[PDB]
Design a binder for this molecule. Structure first.
Ligand code: D1X
Ligand code: D1X
Ligand code: D1X
Ligand code: D1X
Ligand code: D1X
Ligand code: D1X
Ligand code: D1X
Ligand code: D1X
Ligand code: D1X
Ligand code: D1X
Ligand code: D1X
Ligand code: D1X
Ligand code: CL
Ligand code: CL
Ligand code: CL
Ligand code: CL
Ligand code: CL
Ligand code: CL
Ligand code: CL
Ligand code: CL
Ligand code: CL
Ligand code: CL
Ligand code: CL
Ligand code: CL
Ligand code: CL
Ligand code: CL
Ligand code: CL
Ligand code: CL
Ligand code: CL
Ligand code: CL
Ligand code: CL
Lengths: 141, 141, 141, 141, 143, 141, 142, 143, 142, 143, 141, 142
């Protein structure tokens, strides 16, 4: 039933943040779109956002304890955080990595995700809909 | 609206080919699943597979001229072919890269797609459903 | 005319912290010197320090919304944080990167700042006065 | 007299966290063993864990000001945090780096600790006892 | 009295017409005059020199080493290539400030690895023409 | 017992092709030598050559389904083709990589075969006899 | 005096293909322009294009057997194909590598040709005229 | 009507006696004469100059930028090492053709990474002396 | 009788006068006496041996593998270079503890990439001579 | 007739009990006897020698160079580390065949860059202990 | 027998230039020492110093034309100049590369001389006597 | 004044081994040439050669204890042995590295000596006279 959608640093800034790269959809609108999609798939979505690494670790620790699937857009921490990777290694339920922009069409340092090798799957560059497609995978699988 | 699903080398071997990596679904069954999904979304899917790089280039040139969206799993050529990349650079309509296995949880040489930097988006590790989720994105775009 | 001076990890430790590298000037002394210089330049300076990455992200988000220039010394996060770089990418007003020590005369890993490529300019190795020189540039711009 | 044992991200999760890698001992049980061993060696041990980088930095600053020895397991931050390295550089009393797992028998990125070069010594792969052996060194020195 | 050497390397005599979107529209002649005015306001005497010749640049910094005079150096393209220039700068006892008009870290990767930076007192980059003037102000506080 | 000898690009040119490197034996004479040696060992050798990657993949697919051993000299594709390595990964029967020249005594780029890590064994620099030695291995395995 | 001009993958697409990179001349027009220039220089150009590596290899083998010069634009295969390099190594008559675009002003991976080290020479970034200048090299060296 | 600058870098004045197995037996004087004869055939005016001095090469490039004239450049060894020379060439508005006598890709690895190639219009390598004349023919049909 | 083998490699017989700022002023003979005494208190028997010969070190490793005895190993310079010593240590079924006197990570870069660490049970570095004694304590508790 | 030197390096005397899943269950004594029989069937005389000492291996290679006898060499760990061994093998005028029991390319990265491979006639890898026998068969044919 | 001793950039600064690295012997004193050694060996030695690359090339050109041996300390140009290497490649008589300091005990960028591979031999770290020893080599050869 | 000349692996093979690389002078002739030159300089030279790393380490240890200068040609071990480098780090008297061939004109892996950074100086490619020139340095520096 329960799917955890977790957004990392700078993702609360969606809308005004680099619109050509990330789109004009706000995080509030993102939460509403995910919840609407989850209800139509018979799931429950809990969407959380934080710039704090310690907060992100706490949320996925809880998902590990509850054995709930995780949709994770770690933002910049994707490319840098071993600590977040280590937390995500506790997850028994599927972990789907999601990025709004095509991370492979940008700077070289964005192409070597710490999370990708331990995630079930990755969706990149499909904009805001990437979250919704990740939800659909978890509902159908 | 026509969507081109193009599969590269060894993808015609699906089902028998490394089941633990790629799953047990055959390419014939994949064709049927895509065509069923496309019919629900109001799209028309043309699914084709070849082990020949020249044939993949020909199919991509046609999609460039017709300005039709492309879903591409180039198999091994993903990691090697600059020629295929150059063919895909002609596409005006969206290009979605799809991989059945999590290419980032495997050998290091699989983590550096030549196609990702020029694709609209990439779906990795979500099995056969990656194709179907790519169709849904294209149904909204 | 508001200018934000943002200091990152370990900069609150100035004075006793590696004196041969960073000097004997405390953070409070630095705060006083900046405010004195800004007042003589007709600017208002707001100087804040935190060891928390999430906190630094918060302050630059504010400067982005208020369209205010930023003088940033991110400390160790300079060399490691993509998340901080992403937050700084929102800034429409000039961003000046400042370092007290000559970061190129030290360990090799300190020579590859994530912030330099997206900043307007960089001042390195001029001690505390680096902040004051960054202020003077902003007074003319 | 006073020894500071500081544990980084995900080390509060010991016990159920990757048992085959880190063992079945919880953090509560680890605190008890450390306190019992320190009392036998005529020392007082202060054991603290946090997933927050800023919190770790705060604890290091206090040890530097008090000139107290530090036994540090930074977790995933060991491989990533220059900020934590910088704080540890202020320590006048010995710094012993400790890891539960053999960090050299794992992923390549775990083999290049930021703390190792500025530490007095490093104990790796000797399990929970690594903490206790580090205590014994400090009792002799 | 208190003398500061401002030394510009290859292609810096071309300022104004040369890639204006990268280096600005101020000519080198205008830069010389601007530096001299700012220096005199700070109680300093700026000696501003430009050469496309490495040997000439070496000679100038050799003299600054003998006279123990501060140096503000924009070596241009040589910044990224010349060990010889670095070796000469290693003799300087008075402060050495490396200045670049453009933000070299926002450009090609080969520009991000200065040979001079590790032996300089400090580096000012990407602050345009004012970087020279700010370097002078540092030296005015550091006699 | 059937053994498949598969020769890749440029190997049909044996005889005239860089005689100092690859020898003076033609490809037709190679077929005759292998077939004579196979009859002596009580094996059945099918020797085939193609410059077409797709054709080589098809022959490997057939050997995978038939559970037949493969002796493969992929020529230039040894160093470049992930697609060919992917086809060879299907083989349940032993795969033995053969090269006429000493590929380690030439250009550096010839030293990093994609096939070697998944082959049973490799024979290099022993000339045309390398094929015959490979047959002899398979006759006892 | 026969000269083989061989074009690799995606070069049949000249005209529509990234005009800002490769120009607006079509492959049909390219063929005819090469043939006319060759004829004026007292040569005969055989111009062929294929997206198939095996086909390109066959044309190179034939050129090696006939000891005819090759002007080669391998396209994408320039940066990736050892098999093509191996075939070209059999050439004894001059081999000239030609690229329409300045391959050094683009992505890094385009700057490390497998063909360059074994070719007589390389012409890059001079557009369609690169083929014609390669022909003139051959005509001036008879 | 069109003026083209042929600029040769370090060691190119040594052509003829210099490593003949690599650069051929044509002297620099003979090269000048061959270029001027080809330029006269194409209806162009060719000015051929050679120097071992980097500063001198930079000066000639600056003049070509100011005059908006095409440049055929063989920088010799400086091709692989000089950012200063690259920066001067970036100021050119008329076409820049990089020319090398030897096949620079069939030699040492350090010769395969020209600083000038990315900012040039085109590059001709390994065709010997004729590389200069072919570069002239390109400029005759375009500029 | 639980036998622990303490094996020292090249230049460790030179302890005392050998770079005292790096390795301390304790001689190898004094080290042997300290290890043996510490082993006695823990209820173990320590066999301490040193050789500058790689072949000799390999023989001692082979013997310890056949006897299923724990090994405390300071391979010296060979730590950073010897695949052969790694291959021998791979036979050990009983725990292998890598010990270095100096902090090998605070020194030259080539000292930071041990061939032995990835196959050892654990590693003790930079704790001086006491690193041997702590390694014994680990084995006594295990 | 023809004398063939089969030289095994460090840890190969441990075959049988040493990592059976990697190197097989055949002991070194069993390997020696097998090689001797196979060679005698081919009209050759195999001298099989093993040592953990680099110096000892060098001496045996020196003797083969002076006698111009072929060498089959499994240097073990020294394959990936010893320039001294490569230098000794460079003296051999008769064929040198490098042999490894395990597929060294299916293992750790540091095992994939043999110092001996570039100077050997050929290499046999991953075919078990039969690799020695196939190497013998090559030498009997040449050649 | 005439020997050319050629010193490059910064070598005219000997004596006062980094005494701990290059010693206290001036360039004028070096010239006098070479004169004495040349007289003892029975040869002529011409000592030239220039900070100009073009000048150094000219002197090398003259030595090539006269087939005279060269002792070269190119200073900083040793590590940077392909042009100087190309000039030295013309020399038919022996070329001895000489450095006063041990270039291998300093910065990494000093360990990759462009001249070494085309020189007859190299003398490094023997101070000023390196010049005198190089002269003795040329007298005997 | 006693000077130690130490030759590593394969240097006993001089005259036989790759004569186009190392020359036609035997190690015995080298010994005699060194002893003659030492007598001219008022020095005593002890020239010893071994293919064994352990034996070379022992000789270096002896030279460290006696505070005697060392001329060292480690051969192949030059590029591989941290153990030998560690032994040489004990030397208080000067250490001169010598190579007969120009190590920088050969394979890349020969250009990164472990001994060079800790030696007083390095002499390369001056053939047999490299040893004699090394002797003259030590005689001039008392
Ligand atoms: O590297 C990234 C990628 C992001 C995305 O595409 O979702 C967001 C972000 O803040 N940082
Ligand atoms: O590297 C890959 C990845 C594939 C996938 O995951 O779809 C298929 C394939 O043949 N080769
Ligand atoms: O790498 C750095 C550089 C700093 C500076 O020079 O201001 C401060 C800091 O905490 N970490
Ligand atoms: O890379 C590591 C190593 C750990 C350890 O071995 O203690 C713990 C951790 O959380 N992350
Ligand atoms: O790489 C650079 C940087 C320059 C600057 O920014 O001042 C000038 C220049 O000529 N070359
Ligand atoms: O790299 C190689 C090696 C070959 C061989 O040695 O058989 C053949 C080939 O066409 N390309
Ligand atoms: O890398 C390239 C270069 C091309 C060219 O410039 O001719 C063509 C092409 O298809 N791929
Ligand atoms: O690297 C090079 C190449 C040259 C050429 O081929 O023209 C000439 C030169 O002096 N140095
Ligand atoms: O690299 C090392 C480290 C040693 C240690 O710290 O014990 C000893 C040694 O001889 N070589
Ligand atoms: O790297 C290796 C490979 C071996 C083999 O496969 O024969 C043996 C060995 O001791 N070390
Ligand atoms: O890199 C070096 C080395 C020098 C030497 O050791 O003679 C002199 C110099 O100016 N630059
Ligand atoms: O790398 C080398 C260099 C040698 C030399 O030139 O003296 C000798 C040797 O056996 N190995
Ligand atoms: Cl988007
Ligand atoms: Cl697209
Ligand atoms: Cl991806
Ligand atoms: Cl799957
Ligand atoms: Cl300071
Ligand atoms: Cl400490
Ligand atoms: Cl300074
Ligand atoms: Cl900077
Ligand atoms: Cl500007
Ligand atoms: Cl052959
Ligand atoms: Cl297999
Ligand atoms: Cl080119
Ligand atoms: Cl000893
Ligand atoms: Cl173990
Ligand atoms: Cl460690
Ligand atoms: Cl041989
Ligand atoms: Cl192999
Ligand atoms: Cl020479
Ligand atoms: Cl050297």
């Amino acid at each position: 039933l329960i799917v955890n959608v977790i957004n990392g640093p700078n993702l609360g800034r969606l809308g005004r943040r680099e619109p050509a790269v990330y789109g004009g959809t706000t995080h509030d609108e993102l939460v509403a779109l995910i919840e609407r999609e989850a209800a139509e798939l018979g799931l429950k979505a809990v969407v959380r956002q934080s710039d704090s690494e310690a907060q992100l670790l706490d949320w996925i620790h809880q998902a590990a304890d509850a054995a709930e699937p995780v949709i994770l857009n770690a933002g910049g921490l994707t490319h840098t955080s071993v600590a977040l990777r280590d937390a995500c290694a506790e997850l028994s339920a599927p972990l789907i990595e999601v990025h709004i922009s095509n991370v492979h069409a940008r700077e070289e340092f964005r192409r070597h995700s710490y999370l990708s090798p331990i995630a079930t799957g990755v969706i990149v560059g499909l904009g805001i809909q990437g979250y919704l497609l990740a939800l659909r995978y978890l509902a159908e699988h």
